[PDB]
């Protein structure tokens, strides 16, 4: 992820001001997950939906 | 939560934009009420 670039998929964090802006950390947690899911897949064993 | 990025941006949604914007109160209700151990809210803003 470039500096000063918001990915096409991202997570957001509510500022105390109250707005939902892009949080790079959260978006990294999410995008890294997606990557790991592309390479290994994800299990949903034991999940009731 | 199936959320929308376009609250009455486009023509005649009917009452769609209204339904999809209301959902967003759960981001606060989660904290202010008392179901926080029974549900968690995950709002997805579905794109094109």
């Amino acid at each position: 992820i470039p500096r000063e670039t918001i990915p096409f998929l991202h997570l957001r964090k509510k500022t105390p001001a109250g707005d939902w802006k892009y949080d790079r950390q959260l978006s990294s947690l999410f995008l890294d997950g997606l990557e790991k899911a592309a390479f290994n897949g994800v299990t949903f064993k034991d999940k009731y939906v | 939560l199936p959320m929308s990025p376009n609250h009455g941006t486009f023509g005649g949604d009917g009452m769609y934009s209204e339904s999809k914007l209301s959902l967003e109160t759960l981001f606060n209700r989660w904290h202010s009420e008392s179901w926080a151990n029974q549900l968690t809210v995950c709002g997805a803003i579905i794109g094109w």
């Binding site: 096409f8 998929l9 991202h10 997570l11 957001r12 509510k14 939902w20 892009y22 959260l26 999410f30 | 959320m3 990025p5 376009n6 941006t9 486009f10 023509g11 759960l26 981001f27 989660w30 904290h31 968690t40 809210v41 995950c42 709002g43 997805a44 803003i45 579905i46 794109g47 094109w48």
Partner: protein, 97 residues
């Protein structure tokens, strides 16, 4: 609570309604002028160059009819037949039983 932007940057394109609508108009117009101009250049041809010279230029479609079949079984070349069962079998069986 988590909020996930799964909107691939559409957020940024300005006047999205009108922008959207324009693309649609430009497309639809380009389609309808292009199809209306061709339908007229095509009639101009039938006028200038006769409709009997263009009539012997369409092809004839053929439409299927039903050929119900008894569906007998298929008999293979004997070469392949003898490959199925053991060569020992030849004349071993009383075919009357």
């Amino acid at each position: 609570p988590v909020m996930a932007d799964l909107n691939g940057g559409l957020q940024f394109v300005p006047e999205l309604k009108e922008f959207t609508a324009k693309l649609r108009k430009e497309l639809v117009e380009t389609s309808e002028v292009r199809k209306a101009v061709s339908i007229e250049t095509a009639l101009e041809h039938k006028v200038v160059n006769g409709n009997s010279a263009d009539a012997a230029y369409a092809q004839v479609e053929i439409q299927p009819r039903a050929n119900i079949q008894l569906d007998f079984p298929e008999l293979k070349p004997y070469k392949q037949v003898k490959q199925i069962a053991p060569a020992e079998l030849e004349g071993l069986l009383d075919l009357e039983r």
